[PDB]
């Protein structure tokens, strides 16, 4: 992918998450579990829906071929009609195939951006309160319960609340 | 103690202009630029100082053949373009046909 | 001690539908959608209930 | 049927068809393509 999230630093997808395109997997003292994110999912579904409605609706003016008949002494116009009809069909076939090929590339990269943006959204929230594992996971330098996990998912994580607890853990690890 | 700060931001004007994208519609942007004209004055005007030949109720055939109802166009000046009604009332006062009439009108587009 | 973790990931399933891009061919995606029709019944039916004139 | 072609009718449920250019009725737009698939999900992990 262009943004390096899908099949990138997140090596594989999650078969366990079936209710959303993007989401989180947490692991704390109270257990683990998959959970989908609402913000990226809502934006993506509407974004992809609008892309489909743009490719599929901006073709109502496509060339509709009309059957015309010519006699044996009108071969020039009949050949003119044949080449005129084939040309328009070729133009729209090229237009249809190329639009799909390009928008397919953009759609895959659009999903790649959403994953990377969601990861950076979590990253800039925790800051140095957790450790960047480099595999798509953040290892908290403090206890993070189920309420703490959900606060990260909806852009409300309070950095100063756990900053002092994380500072003690960081100094313990650095000292050896 | 809270130290010095620097921030990165972007422009935010007071324009209600909107555009469209593939994945999103009606997106308000700081600067846009229309490239489509949608207004006309509803008149027929001279083409760079040259008055058009407006046939009014007469047709091209009646003008050329000299229909007595077309005395306005006995000696027309130089024109830029010809304006003809879809079905002028004064076309052939005596009924008949004008042979290769469409071919003559094609030639008249270059005169 | 291994601390608590939160991970960011994307959907995956058992779909076999494939798409093509400009730079890459035969890419498997979770969700795809055909937009082309390739079947016909081989008959000459009525057009919206009106029977055609078959000479 | 709602769309008829010289080779047969088509269920007019998709934007495009590749059966025959000469169509009458509520017909999809004709293309010479053999396949037209829009990716809507993300890159599936094997």
């Amino acid at each position, epitope marked *: 992918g262009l943004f390096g999230a899908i099949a990138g630093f997140i090596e594989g997808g999650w078969q366990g998450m079936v*209710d959303g395109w993007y989401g989180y997997h947490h692991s704390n003292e109270q257990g683990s579990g998959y959970a989908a994110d*609402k913000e990226s999912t*809502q934006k993506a*579904i*509407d*974004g*992809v*829906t*609008n892309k*489909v*409605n743009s490719i*599929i*609706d901006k073709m*109502n003016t496509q060339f509709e071929a009309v059957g015309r008949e010519f006699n044996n002494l009108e071969r020039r116009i009949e050949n003119l009609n044949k080449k005129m009809e084939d040309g328009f069909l070729d133009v729209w076939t090229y237009n249809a195939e190329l639009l799909v090929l390009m928008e397919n590339e953009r759609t895959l990269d659009f999903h790649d951006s959403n994953v990377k943006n969601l990861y950076d959204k979590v990253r800039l929230q925790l800051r140095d309160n957790a450790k960047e594992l480099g595999n798509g996971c953040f290892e908290f330098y403090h206890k993070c319960d189920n309420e703490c996990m959900e606060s990260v998912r*909806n852009g409300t994580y309070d950095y100063p609340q756990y900053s002092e607890e994380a500072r003690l853990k960081r100094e313990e690890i650095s000292s050896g | 103690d809270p130290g010095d700060q620097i921030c990165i931001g972007y422009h935010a004007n007071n324009s209600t202009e909107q555009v469209d994208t593939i*994945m*999103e*519609k*009606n997106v308000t942007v700081t600067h846009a630029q229309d490239i489509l004209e949608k207004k006309h004055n509803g008149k027929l005007c001279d083409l760079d100082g040259v008055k058009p030949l407006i046939l009014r109720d007469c047709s091209v055939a009646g003008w050329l053949l000299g229909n007595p109802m077309c005395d306005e166009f006995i000696n027309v000046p130089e024109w830029s373009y010809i304006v003809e009604k879809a079905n002028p009332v004064n076309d052939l006062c005596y009924p008949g046909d004008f042979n290769d009439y469409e071919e003559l009108k094609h030639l008249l587009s270059r005169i | 001690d291994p601390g608590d973790q939160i991970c960011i990931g994307y959907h995956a399933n058992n779909s076999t539908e494939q798409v093509d891009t400009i730079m890459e061919k035969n890419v498997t995606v979770t*969700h795809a*959608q055909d*937009i082309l029709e390739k079947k016909h019944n081989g008959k000459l039916c009525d057009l919206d209930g009106v029977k055609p004139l078959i000479l | 049927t709602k769309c008829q072609t010289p080779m047969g009718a088509i*269920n*007019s*449920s*998709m*934007p495009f068809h590749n059966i025959h250019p000469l169509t009458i009725g*509520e017909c999809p737009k004709y293309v010479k393509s053999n396949r037209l698939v829009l990716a*809507t999900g993300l890159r599936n992990s094997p």
Partner: antibody, heavy 122, light 108 residues
Framework: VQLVQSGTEVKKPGSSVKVSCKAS????????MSWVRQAPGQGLEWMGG????????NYAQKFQGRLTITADGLTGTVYMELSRLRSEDTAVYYC????????????????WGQGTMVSVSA | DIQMTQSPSSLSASVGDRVIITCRAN??????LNWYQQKPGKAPNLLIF???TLQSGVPSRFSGGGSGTDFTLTISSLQPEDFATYYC?????????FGQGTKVDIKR
């Protein structure tokens, strides 16, 4: 665009009702639809939805197993099928397009139909 | 599920008054709320989506705001066209939930 539904149905108990939701014009659309019922003089009730780009239909708990929301491909037409009808199913059934002036909007019902009234008695 | 409760259930006002309708929830829905207006014998018409943004054609007198669990729909100058039932709908959870319904009534 406008959304048009079927006519008023007078069904017998235990039968099935299929209500269509077509759009006006030959245009093809992949907008997500939603079916909402409203009992006579009561409030609105979400029955289910259908997201064409996902190919899935979402249903409600009180309708699961009795409701079938399908679509005629990409023609902008969606269908609902309520089975095992009872007198308590008597209501006005609406179909709404999930769209705003911003384009597709998966949650908000911008364009509505006219409603199809369903009556159930022996 | 996410139960949505409206307050008040049926208010009374006259032309020119400021009408405030509050819609609650039993779970935080993060700004994913919509407002609808139903006139007698007519399909519901959308007024506000995403709890703040007005749908096209809605007069500026209609206003909305809120975040989390408490929401508000406000009509600055009530005109003899806003007398109807108002519903609040969530677009956060898959089992979509509607409000009970608040009916603004003519005062006399």
């Amino acid at each position: 665009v406008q959304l048009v539904q079927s006519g008023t149905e007078v069904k017998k108990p235990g039968s099935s009702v299929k209500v269509s939701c077509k759009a006006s014009g030959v245009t093809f659309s992949s907008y997500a639809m939603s079916w909402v019922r409203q009992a006579p003089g009561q409030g609105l009730e979400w029955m289910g939805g259908f997201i064409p780009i996902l190919g899935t239909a979402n249903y409600a708990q009180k309708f699961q197993g009795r409701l079938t929301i399908t679509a005629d491909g990409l023609t902008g037409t969606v269908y609902m099928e309520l089975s095992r009808l009872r007198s308590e199913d008597t209501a006005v059934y609406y179909c709404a397009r999930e769209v705003t002036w911003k384009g597709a909007s998966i949650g908000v019902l911008g364009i509505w139909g006219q409603g199809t009234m369903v009556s159930v008695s022996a | 599920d996410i139960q949505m409760t409206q307050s008040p259930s049926s208010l009374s006002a006259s032309v020119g008054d400021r009408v405030i309708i509050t819609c609650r929830a039993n779970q935080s829905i993060g700004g994913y709320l919509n407002w609808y207006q139903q006139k007698p014998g007519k399909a519901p018409n959308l007024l506000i989506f995403t709890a703040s943004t007005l749908q096209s054609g809605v007069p500026s007198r209609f206003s909305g705001g809120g975040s989390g669990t408490d929401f508000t729909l406000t009509i600055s100058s009530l005109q003899p066209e806003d007398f109807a039932t108002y519903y609040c709908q969530q677009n956060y959870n898959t089992p979509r939930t509607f409000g009970q319904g608040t009916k603004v009534d003519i005062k006399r």
